[PDB]
Amino acid sequence: LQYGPLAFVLGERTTRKLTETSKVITVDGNICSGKGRLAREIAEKLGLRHFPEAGIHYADSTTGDGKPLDVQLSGNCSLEKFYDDPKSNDGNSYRLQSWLYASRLLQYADALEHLLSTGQGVVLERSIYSDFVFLEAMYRQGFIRKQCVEHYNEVKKVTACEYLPPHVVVYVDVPVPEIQSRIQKKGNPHEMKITAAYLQDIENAYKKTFLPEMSEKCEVLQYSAREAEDAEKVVEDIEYLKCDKGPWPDQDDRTFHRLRMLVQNKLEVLNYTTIPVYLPEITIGAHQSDRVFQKFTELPGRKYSPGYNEDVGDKWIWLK
Amino acid sequence: MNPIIYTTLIMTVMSGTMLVMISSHWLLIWIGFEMNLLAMIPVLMKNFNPRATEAATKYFLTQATASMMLMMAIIINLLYSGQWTITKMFNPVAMTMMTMALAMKLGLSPFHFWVPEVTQGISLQAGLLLLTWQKLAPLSVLCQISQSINPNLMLTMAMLSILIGGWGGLNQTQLRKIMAYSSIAHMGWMTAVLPYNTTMTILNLLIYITMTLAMFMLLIHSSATTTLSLSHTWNKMPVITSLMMVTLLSMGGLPPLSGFMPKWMIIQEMTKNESIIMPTLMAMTALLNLYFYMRLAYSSSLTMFPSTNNMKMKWQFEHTKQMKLLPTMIVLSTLVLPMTPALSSLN
Amino acid sequence: NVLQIVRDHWVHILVPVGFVFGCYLDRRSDEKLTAFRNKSLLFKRELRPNEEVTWK
Amino acid sequence: MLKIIIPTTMLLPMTWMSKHNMIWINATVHSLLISLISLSLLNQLGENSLNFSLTFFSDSLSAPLLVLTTWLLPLMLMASQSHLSKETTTRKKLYITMLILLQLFLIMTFTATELILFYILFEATLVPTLIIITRWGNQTERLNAGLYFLFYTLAGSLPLLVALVYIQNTTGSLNFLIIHYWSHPLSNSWSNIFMWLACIMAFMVKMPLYGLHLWLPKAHVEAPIAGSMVLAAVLLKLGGYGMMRITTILNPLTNYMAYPFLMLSMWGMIMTSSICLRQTDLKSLIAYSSVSHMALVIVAIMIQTPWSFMGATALMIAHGLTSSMLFCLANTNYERVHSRTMILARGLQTLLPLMATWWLVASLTNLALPPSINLIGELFIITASFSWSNITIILMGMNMMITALYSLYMLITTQRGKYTHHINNIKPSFTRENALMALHILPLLLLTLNPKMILGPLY
Amino acid sequence: TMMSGRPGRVPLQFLPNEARSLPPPKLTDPRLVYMGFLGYCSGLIDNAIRRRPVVSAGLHRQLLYVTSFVFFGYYLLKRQDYMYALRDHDMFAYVKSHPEDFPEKDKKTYGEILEEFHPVR
Amino acid sequence: KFYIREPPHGSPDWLKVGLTLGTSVFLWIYLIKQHKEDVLEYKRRNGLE
Amino acid sequence: MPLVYMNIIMAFAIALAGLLMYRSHLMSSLLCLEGMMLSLFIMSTLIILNTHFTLANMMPIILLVFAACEAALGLSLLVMVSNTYGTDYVQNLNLLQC
Ligand SMILES: CCCCCCCCCCCCCCCCCC(=O)OC[C@H](COP(=O)([O-])OCC(O)COP(=O)([O-])OC[C@@H](COC(=O)CCCCCCCCCCCCCCCCC)OC(=O)CCCCCCCCCCCCCCCCC)OC(=O)CCCCCCCCCCCCCCCCC
Ligand SMILES: CCCCCCCCCCCCCCCCC[C@@H](O)O[C@H](CO[C@H](O)CCCCCCCCCCCCCCC)COP(=O)(O)OCC[N+](C)(C)C
Ligand SMILES: CCCCCCCCCCCC(=O)OC[C@H](COP(=O)([O-])O)OC(=O)CCCCCCCCCCC
Ligand SMILES: Nc1ncnc2c1ncn2[C@@H]1O[C@H](COP(=O)(O)OP(=O)(O)O)[C@@H](O)[C@H]1O
């Protein structure tokens, strides 16, 4: 049966299921770094499940079929548009930032659920606690507004105040000129239009706020490009991190039960991502909301519950 | 809180209420009230926060004062009669003390403030349990001792409850405070009909409990605690908003819905006793309750308020937890008017 | 085909069968009010040799 | 009455199980069939009513109203299918369900044999109407209009419930036959005065009486076309039907308590006609015309003579048909130009000829042009009021003059003159709209041919 | 409490043995049909809330809803009929036992009764 | 196979279906028997048949 | 009725008035709440002893038991309020508004 209070009183215990290697590891870095490769290698060598960066359409990947939905029905934002015209008058920048924050929150909830119900560790290519660096970079470049920043802070507080911090934070530090060189070599025009200050602001936010903040919670590993390219030493350093001053040692079976009940309910996870704060960037009118909702319900496997979609090939509906 | 501890506290609350409803001794009735309060306080304080702590403190203070007054009434009745059996009390002063204590427990005006305060303080499940059970028990005691209730005092408190509930619900925007003021008004109706037909009191209690359960389950389903939070539910699951609109129409007493039956039967019974001004005033005052029900219905169902952008992800995901008996509560709170003559079975 | 047409045009019988059922229920309601049949002072009469009731 | 009630309760599943493109066709066809079936109730007796069972009965007053409701449903369906093309299938089905529920409640209201059941049903008619108004109205004022309508009606009706339960306790039964055969005189006392006030005030608010009418312009102007059609044709006649039914037990107190209501009705009829003379909105003009006609009906009922009841019934039926037709015409012109201002669109006589003919016929029937049943009812009421007193002729003549003035003013402003130069989206009139107008107007002339079918039991 | 405390009333007894002497409700009682209709509506609302096909999904669930509603409605109708019959029985017994309070009255025709006439003009 | 993740109600819960159908059948049989017994007892008590 | 009962009832009335009129401290109101049950205990045992209700002598003990249960509940709420606000003042219990 599904996990619940009856299962808890029956005897399913998170501490019993944990195998001393159930660790949450988040690899962070600036734009166009080797953090993805480092996360892949750490997840492979340590046997942990890898969760790539929570971009747009991650919720599409985790629901229905794996195929991503239309941009109009999932996100209503464009990273390419943000790169081309950051100071748009339609709120694209903050729409994208809020949608990406919600996606990262959902991915963190999924990773925590996997760790608590399986005992296997998770390696995230980015987390909730490192998402604000893009918001700070956007605000300091004038791309978004102070009201947008305040709304993001409110949502971040009321949402992330409920989840446990990562066990390990591995940050890959790369100087801005090397970042721009890698961007130039990659050849994608949209990110080739990225200015130098925007890349500098992300680095300033990472070094001055994120790393000092996460250092108090637990140990933080900082690597350069050359060190990160060799993942054997990274894995060896992770393995010999016996210190743990976070809340994970303090957690008990009841607290883990509450956390699992929270993370397995996705609507309860995303409850405060839609709070009635009518910013022009994110507010959607009644008519557009109704039309888009009608289209989403008109999608193939979305009109009814997952077990009750006839057009996708579900049978025995009359006895289900 | 551990699930075993939570379920044993709930069972202790229900055990206290059952002890009150089955006891024939005033001391055992008082014991049941004390046990109910003692096991109820942690239920209110389950989700720890300053608001929950303050609500629990206020509720405990009010219930402790009411229990002290009730025990004093019991002792005074013992002094003048030497009897412990719960029957028509033998002293008017003891009866007045008992009536005031039970009114304070029920939240009747002018002892009402704690009802909206605690209801706003506590969560939706706690508010549901509070309203339902903590109105169930003292009304049982009042029905037992109805034959000695002072009609003037009881009707004064009932009319005050109706007026105050209507006005408070008219002003409020928070859903829990609206529900609390609706509870105050319905308690006023039930206690008004109490000194004439305890069967009608029980009928109104059953209908009110059904409607309140349906409304609170719908609010839990929508995960909305304010008006604007409820205004986004049409974009995620419009069925819930439509069912809630029908339930709100029922709660206002609009025919041919279930909510009209208690008012109709109470008006008939009170008119049988050559009372016309009181039923007319009680019927006219309910228009305030209907007005703020309709104002809530405009925001949620009959119109379409602006939405946000992450509602798309909310669309993509599905409601996992199920509240069983919610369809039954929705049906029974809207479509049981033709089955009215079952009140004889209730008799 | 017939099966496809009937699957779409089966609702058109609902109102006619409701009318038939309503007429039947009217007959049943009338058959419960035969307390003064052939006993009203204005219309009282002797039965014909080959009829059992004056009206149904 | 089950042979008419059950087919509607079967129309509901038909609407909810029909295909997405056949809902209007199915609903219209079967509504017309139900109307044809309900035409059988016009065969009334000359001595007593048609008592089907212990719950439902039909009378020479109930039959024409039931036939009007059953005939009005398909016209509402046509107008709704006109203005609800872009709605989703579920919302179209919900709208049709609201219309069906309203018709069912109206049928049970007009056929209810007991006062308390009549009260329950005629109060139940509010919920579908309120939902329709506040959900499918176009303007921002639909919410305020719904609030006004609901609270006026309920503030009127709650003392009526108290009075009905008190009458049941005092006399033993609320059955109409019992309260008619066992009626006793109402002595002059404060208690009887307030019972009379409760009943009459509930039905006056439903009429509406002058000074209690604001909800009528608010609701009629801001409701959708189907809501406006049903509000004026049938829902206004609940007050008149109730007053005709309830005044059995209120005598002889009605001879003395009718003065304020008669004065209000007459002077407010004059005032609302004058208001129609200076209205900048077409729907408001039609609503105030409805107010004047129902004030005349109130006068007839209050004076309470056999000649007044017949005129009252005829005027109710004729006003229902005429008001429905006028609202439909105004809605067509609104759909053309998306605005209710009367002087915005002109020259419609030279832009749409046959629609101008429909406008002319509707305006001719609105004023009392003989031998129309409008004129029959108005003339009977005027003669009864003349017998009551000889200055009522002065008031009725002033009202008739202003009625003709504002009717022809509306016709001339909307049709005559030169067309607006910049309005170039007035497409030729649709076959559906022309059929709607024809179905509105032809039964009126047929009832003119056969007038005794709508003159009530007093004939 | 009118009928509470009636002599010989067994506590917590939904239907006493003396209720067996009354005609049981017919299985085709319109009240029972309305109870089944309520059960069907409950099943439809269940499907709608859980986002299943309203008329198709969960036929077994709809059947159980209807059956449970019919069962409880049948027993509720039995109890209601018993209580009303008991009320009428007690009322008739009291009327029999108090002839002084309920005396027969002389019946005079309308030819003998003088009623004032109020003209309508 | 349309869903990336197995739906919670992909396959009918045959135990629940059997329980539901059996409960419905048992309740109907019990109601029929109860009505028959009630009719017989009423006839016996009132001396009809 | 003798004057001893008068004094005991007056004591209960004084304790009840003291509870209903807060000054600053929640602890003082708890003390007033404990006094009411003390007066109730004294009144009940004076009534029972005088009338020789032999089986009723166990009632005051149960009264004391539930009195101190209420006292424990009040102390728990008071320590939570103190941890929240720094003082046991009832002025800080104003987040919720009627
Ligand atoms: C039976 C016909 C109806 C009779 C009504 C009479 C009164 C009893 C009501 C019982 C209702 C039960 C079902 C409730 C849930 C319905 C949910 C729904 O959408 O259903 C759509 C569903 C079909 O669409 P679907 O795609 O499957 O639905 C998927 C989504 O739910 C599609 O939804 P969506 O996600 O697209 O969302 C759109 C929609 C979603 O929301 C809704 O659709 C509303 C759902 C709740 C409605 C209220 C439920 C009942 C509450 C009490 C009603 C009291 C009525 C009396 C008082 C006066 C009026 C209030 O939201 C809106 O439109 C929002 C704007 C409008 C809001 C304001 C109006 C709300 C309703 C107020 C009036 C309530 C009374 C009429 C209710 C009619 C319900 C069909 O329609 C039905 O299931 C209709 C019933 C079909 C019965 C078939 C039976 C077998 C065949 C015929 C046999 C006949 C007898 C034969 C005898 C033997 C002959 C030989
Ligand atoms: C629609 C509103 C909610 C309705 C749901 C109510 C649920 C009630 C819960 C119990 C139902 C089943 C009970 C069957 C077993 C218990 C029977 C017995 O224990 O109780 C009987 C009494 O209980 C009731 O009679 C049975 C339940 C009756 C509920 C009828 C609701 C009628 C509401 C009107 C609308 C119709 C709704 C139709 C669908 C429910 C006899 O006890 P008694 O010692 O002698 O009564 C003491 C009360 N006194 C002191 C005042 C006399
Ligand atoms: C009796 C001996 C036989 C054997 C024992 C049977 C025990 C009880 C049967 C168990 C029912 C069951 O398991 O399935 C319930 C089904 C649907 O299941 P689910 O998927 O919704 O959980 O359907 C339902 O959900 C049932 C709906 C009923 C709701 C309650 C109706 C209340 C009736 C009276 C109301 C006034
Ligand atoms: N919160 C955010 N706000 C704006 N842009 C973001 C956010 N998160 C990620 N992105 C964009 O997504 C892209 C992801 O690239 P990335 O995976 O970091 O490249 P690489 O894999 O080479 O390191 C980046 O260009 C970054 O600008």
Coordinates of C-alpha atoms in Angstrom, one line a residue, chain A residues 8-9 59-60 62-63 72-76 95 98-99 102 106 254 265-267 270-271 273-274 276 282-284 286 289 292-293 296 305, chain B residues 1-4 222-223 226 228-229 231-232 234-238 304-321:
Chain A
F8 CA 4.2 4.0 10.0
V9 CA 2.4 2.1 12.9
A59 CA 7.5 18.6 -14.5
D60 CA 6.5 17.5 -18.0
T62 CA 8.0 13.5 -14.4
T63 CA 4.2 13.4 -15.3
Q72 CA 2.3 27.6 -23.8
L73 CA 1.1 24.9 -21.4
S74 CA 4.3 24.4 -19.4
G75 CA 6.2 27.4 -18.2
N76 CA 5.1 30.1 -20.7
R95 CA 8.2 34.3 -15.1
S98 CA 9.7 31.7 -10.8
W99 CA 9.0 28.7 -13.0
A102 CA 9.2 25.8 -8.8
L106 CA 9.7 19.8 -7.3
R254 CA 8.5 10.9 13.3
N265 CA 2.3 14.9 -2.1
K266 CA 3.3 17.1 -5.0
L267 CA 0.3 19.4 -4.6
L270 CA 3.8 23.2 -4.6
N271 CA 1.1 24.7 -2.4
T273 CA 4.1 28.5 -5.4
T274 CA 0.8 30.0 -6.4
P276 CA -2.4 35.5 -4.5
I282 CA 3.2 36.3 -13.3
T283 CA -0.5 37.2 -13.1
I284 CA -2.7 35.7 -15.9
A286 CA -9.3 35.0 -16.5
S289 CA -6.3 31.1 -17.9
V292 CA -5.0 27.5 -21.6
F293 CA -6.6 25.2 -19.0
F296 CA -4.3 21.3 -21.2
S305 CA -6.9 10.5 -13.9
Chain B
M1 CA 3.2 14.2 16.8
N2 CA 3.2 10.4 16.6
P3 CA 0.2 9.0 14.7
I4 CA -0.5 6.6 17.6
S222 CA -8.7 23.1 -2.2
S223 CA -6.0 23.9 0.4
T226 CA -8.4 32.8 2.5
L228 CA -8.1 34.9 -2.7
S229 CA -6.6 31.5 -2.1
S231 CA -10.3 32.3 -6.0
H232 CA -7.6 30.2 -7.7
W234 CA -11.6 27.3 -10.4
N235 CA -8.4 27.1 -12.6
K236 CA -7.3 23.8 -11.1
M237 CA -10.5 21.8 -10.4
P238 CA -13.7 23.7 -11.2
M304 CA -13.3 33.8 -12.7
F305 CA -10.6 35.5 -10.7
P306 CA -7.0 36.0 -12.1
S307 CA -4.6 33.1 -11.8
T308 CA -0.8 32.6 -11.7
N309 CA 1.8 30.8 -13.8
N310 CA 2.7 27.8 -11.6
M311 CA -0.9 26.7 -11.8
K312 CA 0.2 25.0 -14.9
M313 CA 2.4 22.6 -12.9
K314 CA -0.5 22.3 -10.4
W315 CA -2.6 21.2 -13.4
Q316 CA 0.1 18.6 -14.4
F317 CA -0.1 17.1 -10.9
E318 CA -2.9 15.2 -9.3
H319 CA -4.6 15.1 -5.9
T320 CA -3.3 12.1 -4.0
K321 CA -5.0 11.9 -0.6

